RNA sequence: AAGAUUAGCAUGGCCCCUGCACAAGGAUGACACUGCGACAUU
């Protein structure tokens, strides 16, 4: 029960939701809980954060009159509304013709917490247009048996984030099935305890001097207009939007081919940035992350192999 | 008496080269969803 790591846990929502948000208009981000508690409060939170509007759901009947209580002295029902759902119907409520959910969020109790997260995985299949779930954990060991069955399905959209604050270590898990890819900070933590179970990386890193400092926009330039990347240039960040793999031997030998075959397949959108002699390369959008892995070691390649 | 970290080696994919495809191999420098633990501390 800690309101700072019930802050940084919608901070975390919101560092989630804000990197991976894009060009799109402001539209108004509609939250879903999953087990608001007797104290109902993430959703308060989150509205006094930043104006979400969450429609939370409710197993219990003297907590949601509780969650009823605190909406009447709290007073944000266009943001707040509390739902009694069914045991056996998919607790993922439906969209009833409103507007549609963008991010879920989860306190599970702590089948147990990983069949809890099962029956999220299950259900979460059935649904589209939502875009962000989580999960958050205390025990250590619900990472692996969580993981290794989100190591079942493919599920590549996912991310541990170490909630750190003195003795209170917690792990949330965040998977979506939508292609947006947060920073590298929100989902692969410093500590190799869990190097088992990280996910994949979304950022990489290069130091250089001041000659390559002066030379880094005339080498990312070259590198971007000799590969037939999509690229453009916002200020001093290099943004790039491919719709599939246009930078490997691979791609290559199909491309200097005859047959009939299209594309190695798989959408990236990333930004290259340039911070005190150091290039980012930063992965933005993307199901596949063999796309970006290939990408950042074709640029690790052309940050090297241009030394001599 | 009970185990982690840590320095080298197999394995896995990624960039480069050979290769029609699948393979296989080479070379190379960052990785880890795999282990192998010659020291030293806890």
């Known amino acids: 029960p ?3 790591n019930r802050a940084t846990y919608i901070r975390y929502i919101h560092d989630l939701l804000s990197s991976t948000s894009g060009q799109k208009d402001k539209k108004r981000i509609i939250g879903l809980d999953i087990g608001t508690g007797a ?11 930043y104006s979400y509007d969450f429609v939370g759901t409710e197993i219990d009947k003297f ?3 509780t969650a009823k209580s605190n909406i009447l002295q709290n007073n944000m029902e266009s943001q707040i509304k509390i739902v009694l759902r069914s045991k056996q119907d998919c607790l993922l409520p439906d969209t009833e013709g409103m507007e549609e959910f963008t991010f879920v969020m989860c306190n599970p109790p702590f089948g147990g917490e990983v069949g809890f997260a099962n029956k999220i995985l299950t259900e979460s299949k059935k649904r589209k247009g939502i875009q962000w779930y989580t999960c958050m954990f205390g025990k250590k060991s619900s990472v692996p048996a969580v993981v290794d069955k989100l190591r ?3 599920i590549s959209n996912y991310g541990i984030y170490e909630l750190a604050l003195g003795k209170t270590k917690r792990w949330i898990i965040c ?6 890819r947060p920073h590298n900070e929100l989902i692969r933590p410093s500590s190799t305890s869990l190097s088992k179970y990280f996910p994949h990386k979304v ?3 290069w130091t250089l001097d001041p000659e390559l400092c002066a030379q880094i926009d005339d080498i990312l330039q070259k590198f971007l207009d000799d590969n037939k990347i999509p690229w453009s240039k916002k200020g001093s960040v290099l943004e790039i939007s491919t719709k599939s793999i246009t930078w490997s031997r691979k ?3 199909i491309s200097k081919s005859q047959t009939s075959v299209s594309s190695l397949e798989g959408q990236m959108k990333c930004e290259l940035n340039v911070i005190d002699n150091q290039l980012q390369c930063k992965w933005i959008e993307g199901y596949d992350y063999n796309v970006y892995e290939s990408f950042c070691s074709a640029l690790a390649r ?3 192999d241009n030394k001599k």
């Open 175 to 180: 998977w979506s099935f939508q292609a947006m």
């Open 39 to 49: 104290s109902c409060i993430y959703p308060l939170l989150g509205c006094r954060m």
């Open 251 to 253: 791609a290559r030998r």
């Open 2 to 4: 800690m309101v700072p």
């Open 302 to 304: 052309a940050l090297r």
């Open 203 to 205: 950022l990489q890193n």
């Open 152 to 154: 079942e399905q493919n």
């Open 63 to 65: 907590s949601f009159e």
